[PDB]
Scaffold this active site. Structure first.
Site, mmCIF file in Angstrom:
data_model
loop_
_atom_site.group_PDB
_atom_site.id
_atom_site.type_symbol
_atom_site.label_atom_id
_atom_site.label_comp_id
_atom_site.label_asym_id
_atom_site.label_seq_id
_atom_site.Cartn_x
_atom_site.Cartn_y
_atom_site.Cartn_z
ATOM 1 C CB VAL A 26 -1.153 -0.001 1.061
ATOM 2 C CG1 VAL A 26 -0.886 -1.003 2.160
ATOM 3 C CG2 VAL A 26 -1.445 1.435 1.635
ATOM 4 N N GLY A 27 1.810 1.425 0.908
ATOM 5 C CA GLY A 27 2.594 2.677 1.080
ATOM 6 C C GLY A 27 4.116 2.575 0.978
ATOM 7 N N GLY A 28 9.336 3.070 7.059
ATOM 8 C CA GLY A 28 8.831 1.736 6.667
ATOM 9 C C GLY A 28 7.856 1.582 5.487
ATOM 10 C CB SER A 29 7.389 -0.980 2.957
ATOM 11 O OG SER A 29 7.933 -0.260 1.868
ATOM 12 C CG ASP A 160 1.816 9.186 10.939
ATOM 13 O OD1 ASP A 160 2.141 8.056 11.345
ATOM 14 O OD2 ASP A 160 1.565 9.411 9.711
#
Ligand SMILES: CCCCCCCCO[C@@H]1O[C@H](CO)[C@@H](O)[C@H](O)[C@H]1O
Length: 330
Positions: A26-27, A28-29, A160
């Site tokens: 989808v997007g 560390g990984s 976050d």
């Protein structure tokens, strides 16, 4: 202790329990994964190089401590943390599992034109979460559409904690330590945009940003100028002609006057007077959602570790401790 399997994705290897299946980038990984244990879809994050440095290792630890602490419907939480390592000596990889959120608030204001009821619900959810974050003594410091996950049901989580567009002016002045209300400023910027479809202060750099802010809220009262130690900051504010304090009513014509009043009380130049999350939750604008018996506060949070310079292996070891001591939720 689970069964791990390995797998190449994009460019990196992943070693995760079998409980997690169909990992999808989808997007560390961050991969999306099917939690075979719960039937739910989840997000698995592989921290980059967690112990690459003193700065990386303390951050990793900070991120783990933060996520372990956050237990609130409107704040990202931890479902699992694991590592393939079986001893402290092997330990080099950290994985965090959380609810798969899949869309942010940017993907929401950007491809829609929201109604008033929608803005009440979203903002209320920010503030409910922020009340819990603040009551832990944590300032988030980077609230912006992209740190807010909004599911298809308009449920919201803050991501976050602990873009200049959402930054309180005092931060832009640097300013030798500040308070929680720096977040209320961000929220006020987010709200404005939700209501208007426009970025409130799309500053080009930190200087411009101050200009744009002043255009709206007006040059500081002498009682606020009195508090600015910096002469060059002093000078720049008194430079660029004394600016006309606008009427929020005109800046936000068409908005629910309750929304307009609340904005006025959030985007106060003096962080001392800026309304607090607890207060704003009781403002009339939220009368349909508010409920003082369902806006919980956080157990106090130990962040004394922020005040220390430790060695990598020390941060590493403390992080290892936290993984192993993780207790999952219901
Ligand atoms: C564009 C000019 C910026 C306006 C000044 C910002 C006002 C912020 O407010 C100030 O924040 C400080 C940091 O916590 C506090 O120490 C002061 O008490 C508070 O009034």
């Amino acid at each position: 202790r689970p069964t791990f399997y390995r797998q190449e994705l994009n460019k990196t290897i992943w070693e995760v329990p079998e409980r997690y299946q169909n990992l999808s980038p989808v997007g560390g990984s961050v991969c999306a994964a099917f939690d075979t244990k719960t039937g739910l879809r989840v997000a698995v994050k592989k921290l980059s190089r967690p112990f690459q440095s003193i700065i990386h290792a303390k951050r990793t630890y900070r991120e783990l401590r933060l996520l372990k602490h956050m237990k609130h419907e409107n704040v990202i939480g931890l479902l699992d943390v694991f590592t393939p390592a079986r001893s402290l000596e092997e330990f080099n990889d950290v994985y965090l599992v959380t609810h798969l959120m899949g869309a942010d608030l940017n993907n929401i204001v950007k491809c829609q034109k929201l109604t008033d009821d929608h803005v009440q619900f979203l903002i209320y959810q920010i503030l409910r979460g922020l009340k819990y974050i603040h009551s832990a003594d944590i300032i988030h410091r980077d609230l912006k559409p992209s740190n807010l996950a909004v599911n298809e049901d308009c449920e919201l989580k803050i991501l976050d904690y602990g873009t200049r567009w959402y930054r309180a002016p005092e931060i832009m002045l640097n300013w030798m330590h500040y308070n929680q209300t720096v977040d209320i400023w961000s929220v006020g910027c987010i709200m404005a945009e939700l209501l208007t479809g426009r970025t409130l202060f799309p500053g080009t750099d930190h200087i411009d940003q101050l200009k744009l802010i002043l255009r709206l809220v007006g040059t500081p009262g002498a009682e606020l100028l009195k508090k600015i130690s910096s002469e060059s900051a002093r000078n720049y504010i008194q430079s660029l002609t004394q600016m006309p304090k606008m009427n929020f009513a005109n800046v936000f014509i068409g908005a629910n006057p309750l929304a307009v009043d609340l904005l006025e009380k959030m985007l106060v130049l003096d962080s001392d007077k800026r309304i607090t999350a607890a207060q704003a939750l009781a403002h009339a604008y939220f009368a349909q959602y508010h409920d003082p018996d369902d806006e919980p506060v956080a157990d106090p949070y130990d962040q004394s570790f922020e005040s220390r310079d430790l060695l990598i292996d020390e941060w590493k070891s403390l992080t290892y401790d936290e993984v192993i001591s993780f207790v999952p939720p219901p």
